[PDB]
Design a protein around this nucleic acid. Structure first.
Lengths: 309, 57, 211, 481, 46, 57
RNA sequence: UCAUCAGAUGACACAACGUUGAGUGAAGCACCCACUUGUAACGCCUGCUCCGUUAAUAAGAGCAGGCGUUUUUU
């Protein structure tokens, strides 16, 4: 069919659209769904619906848009009844399963990672079959959430360990089948002798690091920090031309620093003959977060240093 | 499996054969050891498990 | 082949059957190509499906066997007909080595010292029970098949009662001296049978899992 | 090589093996490791139990421990014992007696921790049962003529009456006299252990295990070492604990007790690397980056490198950054002590033999590693897998309170809208006449003002009704609720 | 059946795809608007 | 716990527990009344005999 | 605390390759590939491997620099 139109909605029908682009987002969501196997497209805001009517002429498909209609009831559509499950799923880092198993859609900086967690039932039975069963359910949910969360790239998975190689292969085949309905660039691979699974990409097209720890999942322990910062300070203390030492740290830190370890601090003053040491607990600073500056009242410098940093 | 205890059963049954269609039998056989080695195809019990001592017996 | 031209007769005689034997109908479905893997090739099936359609209408149960498997079918059947008991076993087959000791927990155990030893051939000494060389080597010697059977029979006979009373585990542990060659092979095969019968199973080669 | 030991503060024990001025092996002691297992201890019976036929004993504060009846020795039993099944612990000893005991089972249950009267001694070559004579013989791994001739060598050696011995699995057995040496050394240590315990009746820790010495010498130390450094001379003699007690005094030369006016680690200027061991991303040594993160399902690393934006550089230079990296990967590897699932994102290159080359550089580092490592070829996508089993089988603030492990901030606006829709879904629910809720203040700050009439609509619909920490309770003053 | 409902794509019963509006969009230069070492393409890093 | 001298181990739990009868619970294994209770139950016979067939074999 | 149910030890042995191909894994060690082509500069240096040498030191080679000053560009 393409061959005949090459010389040439018909090409005549195509010509009208070509004028605008040659002469020259939410409607682009309509361009994302060119399949248009959808009949019901209901809008609660009539102004948006009238904008859709303006976009029905630009879309140039009134016959496809015949079923489009603003609708009061989201619940009958499930827009206000069923959809909401997935609605918050797209931000659930972990997804339960109808089988009860679950996944952990991780966001490692180097690459995307997901392990699948079996339904941790009260007892264990036929754990191997359970693995494949849960695995199959998982695989199904995989592509769904994958597209839905809109993340792809260097994806890898770690399944529940699957001994029967042929059955593992069947699982892989299920994966191949998973995305047949999807329209995106995909390239699956085979299991890992480890048990990992290299996966495909989704780069076709809302958050930031957490306030505490600057996006690091964990936090180093205070007792660990009691010695770390101390070493830092003594290190900078030996810096030449240094007159005094400024230290910024949150309260629970300086607490166990000075009162609990006063001796070393004073010993640090005796070894570092002649260079002053100041330590400033600050409520605003986070548990790992702090600063330091060796070049104001002992209880009133942090304002100045804060105006600095 | 479909083996009656009375002999004459299949005898008279063969008698009732209509259309004088040639009732040509076929039969297979092999040795005890071969059979046993072959009867372990994850198959069910020799229906003669009525306190029958052993697969062999 | 058994499908009548006029199923009115089918249901008529289906009426004829005596009451005591309750009839039930199961229908099956899978992907067209899925069926090809187990197996013209589109139209044969299409017209035949028209022939079969009355049954699917009359089907008591219909299953989608596209991703099916023997165990899937066996469990599906067990619950389909025998009904589901939350009471359920989980047989654990362990292969232990009498050197190291009988498993601390074990309901039944069987010594398999008498059965032919793969140990005799030296090329086998390193390889373990799950290397197809030894698997073969046993498979030949009949006595192995003889034992695997008789044992499977013994368990099968005493398996129902144990189902009663809601036992949560039943462990059978099979022991060679070292527990690498014979006991392993027997544990594996012996498991697979019971797997086929659809009961839940779990293997454990205690000596190999040491390292 | 060079060995670095810092014990200025006994809390943190930082010890390291640096080639030249760069640290290689890592054993920074984590206080709270609490490897109490096999630690000799004192205390007094807390609760003789006829029903459990066991006696609680207060070694320490957490629990009163456990003592199986059978484990008890002659010293606990009275001079006039009787055999009637001997189930009577009250007959064996009245509670409160001073005790000799080693950690046996790491408490890992609400049940007590377990302890045994029969103490044990951990010798490099040998293990002594100071009291129980029964135990004896040779471990598995050693066999054959070694088993035959070593059984001749141990038979030649003489042990105190009533003392058993278990030759460690490291049974070279080459020097019967070496066996004699280390044994006797343990014998004197065992004699020194009970005497010192006779100091006082209170509960106290007689002996214990610490990477400071048990792991520092048997595992970390090698004959190749050229320098031994010690900061706290207080434990210099604690170092002489082993200087020759290991049976190889040749390190007497090695001992070089630190006496400089500079902290020993800076004296070799290693703290840069040391911090790298925790700093999330490490600048590549030649130049670039090697970024590490743990999925907690796996662990992944990436090597965005060359430290540039626009310049003249080539794929064989990026391939050059991949080879140089491999090592630093291994370094960081052993250091932060990873074990499990490890995957890379090597920047890929056209030269396939370069791929073989880089993996070859990786495998060479894997061979010199103490751990056991599995390696795999690169991916078609390039993600190369690798699994190294943890050498150290040892909630360390795993999730920050705001981060929750995610370290990711739900946008304030998104946070608001989720809450609003949840509110509406709650209002329509049967038996709803109010929707009280807890919400981060900053969200509320910009929330209502933009959504005055929106909330008005929310109210009209069902008439009659930090960022992670939002919890709305439906009802069938704000500042006090 | 398929229903479109923040933007929602419901395929039959389950949700086949999702689409939300956030400030800005993934648009190439002058999508909806208008060998030198440094140039002004809206920036100079590239 | 399992005796260390055991070469085979055959659980027998699922057989009818004589415990049910409080009267028989104090009585030991060798006391004829329990032998009667066991004799009353044929399943016992089935087990003994089938186990005799399993070993002898 | 009686029941019941659920919850790091003798005497041995270890050939021939004709176990050869009856049946070739498991883990190491080696080599061996592939096919789409889409900031400087100097200051002084409380020091670290080494390497040279004679003179172990010491002087000296290379200089992740900790940072002073100077222009200054990343």
């Amino acid at each position: 069919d393409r061959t005949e139109l090459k010389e040439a909605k018909s090409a005549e029908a195509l010509q009208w659209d070509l004028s605008f682009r040659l002469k020259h987002v939410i409607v682009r969501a309509f361009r994302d769904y060119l399949r248009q196997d959808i009949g019901e497209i209901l809008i609660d805001n009539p102004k948006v619906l009238e904008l859709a009517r303006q976009h029905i002429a630009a879309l140039g498909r009134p016959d496809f848009s015949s079923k489009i209609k603003l609708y009061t009831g989201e619940i009958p559509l499930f827009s206000h009844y069923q959809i909401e499950s997935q609605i918050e799923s797209a931000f659930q880092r972990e997804v339960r399963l109808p089988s009860g198993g679950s996944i952990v859609i991780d966001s490692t900086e180097a690459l995307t990672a997901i392990d699948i967690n079996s339904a941790r039932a009260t007892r264990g039975g036929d754990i191997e079959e359970t693995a494949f069963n849960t695995n199959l359910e998982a695989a199904d949910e995989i592509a769904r959430q994958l597209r839905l969360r809109d993340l792809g790239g260097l994806i890898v998975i770690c399944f529940i360990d699957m001994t029967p190689v042929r059955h593992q292969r069947a699982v892989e085949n299920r994966l191949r089948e998973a995305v047949r309905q999807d329209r995106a660039r995909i390239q699956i691979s085979h299991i890992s002798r480890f048990g990992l699974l290299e996966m495909s990409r989704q780069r076709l097209s809302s958050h930031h690091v957490c306030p505490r720890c600057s996006g690091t999942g964990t936090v180093r322990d205070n007792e660990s920090l009691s010695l770390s910062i101390l070493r830092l300070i003594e290190e900078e203390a030996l810096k030449e031309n240094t007159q005094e030492v400024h230290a910024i740290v949150p309260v629970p830190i300086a607490s166990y620093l000075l009162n609990e370890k006063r001796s070393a601090v004073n010993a640090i003053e005796t070894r570092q003959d002649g260079v002053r040491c100041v330590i400033v607990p600050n409520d605003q600073m986070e548990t790992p977060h702090y600063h330091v500056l060796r070049v104001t009242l002992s209880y009133m410098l942090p304002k100045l240093h804060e105006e600095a940093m | 499996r479909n083996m009656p205890e009375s002999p004459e059963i299949f005898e008279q049954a063969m008698s009732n054969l209509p259309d004088a269609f040639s009732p040509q039998l076929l039969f297979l056989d092999a040795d005890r050891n071969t059979l046993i080695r072959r009867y372990s195809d994850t198959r069910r019990l020799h229906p003669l498990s009525s306190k029958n001592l052993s697969l062999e017996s | 082949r058994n499908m009548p031209e006029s199923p009115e007769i089918f249901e008529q005689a289906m009426s004829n059957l005596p009451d005591a034997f309750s009839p039930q109908l199961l229908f099956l479905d899978a992907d067209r190509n899925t069926l090809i893997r187990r197996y013209s090739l589109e139209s044969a099936i299409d017209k035949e499906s028209d022939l079969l359609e009355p049954l699917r209408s009359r089907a008591d149960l219909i299953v989608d066997t596209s991703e099916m498997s023997v165990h899937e079918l066996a469990e599906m059947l067990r619950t389909r007909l025998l009904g589901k008991r939350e009471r359920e076993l989980t047989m654990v087959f362990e292969s232990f080595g009498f050197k190291h000791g009988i498993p601390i927990d074990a309901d039944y155990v069987f010594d398999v010292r008498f059965l032919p030893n793969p140990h005799w051939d030296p090329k086998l000494r390193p390889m373990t029970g799950l290397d197809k060389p030894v698997a073969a080597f046993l498979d030949r010697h009949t006595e192995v098949h003889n034992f695997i059977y008789q044992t499977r029979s013994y368990l099968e006979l005493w398996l129902p009662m144990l189902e009663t009373n809601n036992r949560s585990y039943l462990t059978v542990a099979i022991g060679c001296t070292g527990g690498k060659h014979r006991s392993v092979y027997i544990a594996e095969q012996l498991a697979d049978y019971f797997r086929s019968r659809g009961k839940n199973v779990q293997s454990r080669h205690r000596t190999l899992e040491k390292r | 090589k060079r060995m670095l030991i810092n014990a200025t503060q006994q809390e943190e024990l930082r010890v390291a093996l640096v080639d030249g001025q760069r640290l290689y092996d890592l054993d920074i002691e984590s206080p709270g490791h609490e490897q109490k297992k096999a630690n000799i201890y004192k205390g007094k019976i807390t609760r003789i139990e006829p029903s459990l036929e066991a006696a609680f004993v207060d070694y320490g504060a957490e629990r009163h421990g456990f003592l199986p009846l059978k484990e008890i020795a002659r010293e606990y039993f009275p001079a006039n014992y009787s055999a009637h099944g001997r189930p009577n612990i009250k007959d064996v000893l009245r509670e409160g007696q001073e005790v000799i005991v080693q950690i046996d089972k790491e408490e890992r249950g609400n049940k007590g921790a377990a302890l045994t009267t029969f103490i044990s001694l951990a010798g490099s070559y040998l293990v002594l049962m100071p009291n129980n004579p029964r135990a004896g013989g040779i471990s598995r791994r050693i066999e054959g003529d070694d088993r035959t001739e070593l059984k001749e060598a141990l038979a030649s050696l003489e042990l105190p009456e009533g003392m058993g011995l278990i030759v460690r699995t490291a049974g070279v057995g080459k020097s019967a006299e070496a066996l004699q040496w280390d044994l006797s050394f343990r014998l004197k240590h065992w004699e020194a252990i009970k005497k010192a315990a006779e100091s006082r009746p209170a509960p106290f820790l007689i002996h214990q295990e610490s990477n400071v010495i048990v792991r520092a010498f048997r595992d970390y130390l090698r004959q190749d070492i050229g320098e031994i450094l010690i900061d706290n001379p207080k434990v210099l003699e604690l170092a002489r604990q082993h200087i020759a007690a290991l049976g190889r005094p040749d390190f007497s030369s090695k001992i070089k007790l630190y006496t400089g006016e500079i902290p020993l680690f800076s004296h070799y200027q290693i703290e840069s690397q040391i911090e790298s061991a925790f700093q999330r991303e490490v600048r590549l040594p030649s130049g670039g980056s090697i970024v590490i993160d743990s999925t907690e399902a796996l662990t992944a690393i990436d090597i965005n490198s060359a430290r540039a934006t626009r310049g003249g550089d080539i794929e064989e230079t990026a391939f050059n950054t991949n080879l140089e990296a491999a090592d630093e990967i291994a370094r960081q590897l052993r250091l932060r002590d990873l074990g499990g699932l490890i995957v890379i994102c090597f920047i890929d290159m056209t030269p396939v033999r370069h791929q073989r080359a880089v993996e070859n550089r990786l495998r060479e580092a894997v061979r010199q590693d103490r751990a056991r490592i599995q390696i795999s070829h690169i991916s078609r996508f390039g993600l190369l897998e690798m699994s190294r089993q943890r050498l150290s089988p040892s909630s360390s603030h795993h999730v920050c309170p705001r981060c929750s492990g995610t370290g990711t901030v739900r946008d304030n606006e998104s946070l608001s809208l989720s809450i609003l829709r949840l509110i509406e879904e709650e209002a329509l629910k049967e038996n709803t006449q109010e929707v009280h809720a807890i919400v981060p203040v900053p969200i509320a700050s910009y929330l209502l003002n933009e959504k005055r009439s929106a909330v008005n609509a929310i109210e009209t619909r069902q008439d009659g009704v930090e960022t992670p920490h939002y919890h709305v309770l439906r009802v069938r003053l704000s500042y006090m609720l | 059946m398929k229903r479109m409902l923040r933007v929602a794509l419901v395929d039959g019963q389950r949700l086949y795809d999702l689409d939300i509006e956030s400030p800005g969009h993934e648009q190439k230069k002058a999508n909806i608007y208008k060998e030198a070492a440094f140039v002004d393409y809206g920036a100079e890093r590239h």
